[PDB]
Write a protein that binds this ligand. Structure first.
Ligand SMILES: CO[C@H]([C@H](C)/C=C/N(C)CO)[C@@H](C)C(=O)CC[C@H](C)[C@H](C[C@@H]1OC(=O)C[C@@H](O[C@H](N)O)C[C@H](C)C[C@H](O)[C@H](C)[C@@H](OC)c2coc(n2)-c2coc(n2)-c2coc(n2)/C=C/C[C@H](OC)[C@H]1C)OC
Ligand SMILES: Nc1ncnc2c1ncn2[C@@H]1O[C@H](COP(=O)(O)OP(=O)(O)OP(=O)(O)O)[C@@H](O)[C@H]1O
Ligand SMILES: [Ca+2]
Ligand SMILES: [Ca+2]
Length: 363
């Protein structure tokens, strides 16, 4: 009996089989319907046929907002991407920190009534990422395509009163890179061009240890410049934009947001926790999600947190190499454990108790 693990993000779905080291399927969280031969398309195919479709993202800042399109995503995941019959597999799903109770119930109803799963469970994304690092205590910085959270976790369980949310993440960074490249004299505005710039961001951007110092290097030399061959055949050159783009995480004012940067929100989150556990959190800052993939980010975070924390505090930033998929991995591990098998919501329990069973069984 093989459990499935489906990690639904704002930008990407990561899906596969519990016990595997990586998701089998990773595809965009998009649903397309024809503009005025199929009635709907999902993921890669929807992207490929965009010219004749209207696209929608059913998950916004980590929260499911379009339930009909979300059902389409799950159907596509089971039947087309993984090629499984969902009625044959226990299914672990993930959710954002502070996901409303009613959303959890809707997820539960759909899984049992629409897909007829034999069992299910819903876990908090950041908690899973911590488990994937071999820890049950620490503070997670989870940053994806749509949302960023700080989530302190103690002895296996999130501390909800100390969780911080920031609606600044990868899509915002892609858009800002587009803007600053256009200012350089290139032209990136269209949808095809957004996809191109996202690739540039992922290949060439990095976090500077010191922003001003690196700006000065870029102003007076070509040493930080890299080139990129566009699909249309123009080779462009990229310099300070490489580190200016993700600098926005530390200084959101670059895109006109008033928020604290990720170092300050981490600190604020720790300070909302019991004094007895803060040292444990400071020593176990774990980074998760695609927007934490920038080279240089761990060292920069070490620097910035050290400057905020008491002078004698021991601080460690952990940045696992597989952290694009840490949420999914944690789910794969959790759903594999013998101790976990009693934690599943069963179809019998659903049939008797209804969707609210999820509140009794899922932390
Ligand atoms: C039962 O759950 C309770 C509670 C009821 C739940 C509460 N909530 C859900 C709260 O919200 C919960 C508190 C708790 O116990 C969770 C435990 C965690 C999932 C986790 C469990 C441990 O698990 C852990 O400690 C996880 C770590 O395993 C190891 N062995 O140290 C992960 C590594 C550091 C990194 C990977 O090697 C690396 C990322 C990569 O390696 C190739 C990899 C990718 O995928 C995998 N590894 C993978 C997928 O499946 C597995 N690995 C697998 C499936 O089973 C296991 N491994 C078993 C490993 C033995 C571990 O102990 C060393 C395991 C017990 O501990 C951090
Ligand atoms: N090497 C990289 N450098 C910078 N960003 C990257 C890199 N790899 C992936 N990303 C970005 O990570 C994002 C996707 O990450 P992830 O899958 O963790 O997000 P999600 O789960 O879809 O979104 P969210 O968690 O915000 O709901 C995209 O914005 C993508 O461009
Ligand atoms: Ca995510
Ligand atoms: Ca500011």
């Amino acid at each position: 009996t093989t459990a499935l693990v489906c990690d639904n993000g704002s930008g990407l779905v990561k899906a596969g089989f519990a016990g595997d080291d990586a998701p089998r399927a990773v595809f965009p969280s998009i649903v397309g319907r024809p503009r005025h031969q199929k009635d709907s398309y999902v993921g890669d195919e929807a992207q490929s046929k965009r010219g004749i479709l209207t696209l929608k993202y059913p998950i916004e800042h980590g929260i499911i907002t379009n339930w009909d399109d979300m059902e389409k995503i799950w159907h596509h995941t089971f039947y087309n991407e993984l090629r499984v019959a969902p009625e044959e597999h226990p299914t672990l799903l993930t959710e954002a920190p502070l996901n409303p109770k009613a959303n959890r119930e809707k997820m539960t109803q759909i899984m049992f009534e629409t897909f007829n799963v034999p069992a299910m469970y819903v876990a908090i994304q950041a908690v899973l990422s911590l488990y994937a690092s071999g820890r049950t205590t620490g503070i997670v910085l989870d940053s994806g395509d749509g949302v960023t959270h700080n989530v302190p976790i103690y002895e296996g369980y999130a501390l909800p009163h100390a969780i911080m949310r920031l609606d600044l993440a990868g899509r915002d960074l892609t858009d800002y890179l587009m803007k600053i490249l256009t200012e350089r004299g290139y032209s990136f505005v269209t949808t095809a061009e957004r996809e191109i710039v996202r690739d540039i961001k992922e290949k060439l951007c990095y976090v500077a240890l010191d922003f001003e110092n690196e700006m000065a290097t870029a102003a007076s030399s070509s040493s930080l410049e890299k080139s990129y061959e566009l699909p249309d055949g123009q080779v462009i050159t990229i310099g300070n934009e490489r580190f200016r783009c993700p600098e926005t995480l530390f200084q959101p004012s670059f895109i006109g947001m008033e928020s604290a940067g990720i170092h300050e929100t981490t600190y604020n989150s720790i300070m909302k926790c019991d004094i007895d556990i803060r040292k444990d959190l400071y020593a176990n800052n774990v980074m998760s999600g695609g927007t934490t993939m920038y080279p240089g980010i761990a060292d920069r975070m070490q620097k910035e947190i050290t400057a905020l924390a008491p002078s004698t505090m021991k601080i460690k930033i952990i940045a696992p190499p597989e952290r694009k998929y840490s949420v999914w991995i944690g789910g794969s591990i959790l759903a594999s454990l013998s101790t976990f098998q009693q934690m599943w919501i069963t179809k019998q329990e659903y049939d008797e108790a209804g969707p609210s069973i999820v509140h009794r069984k899922c932390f």
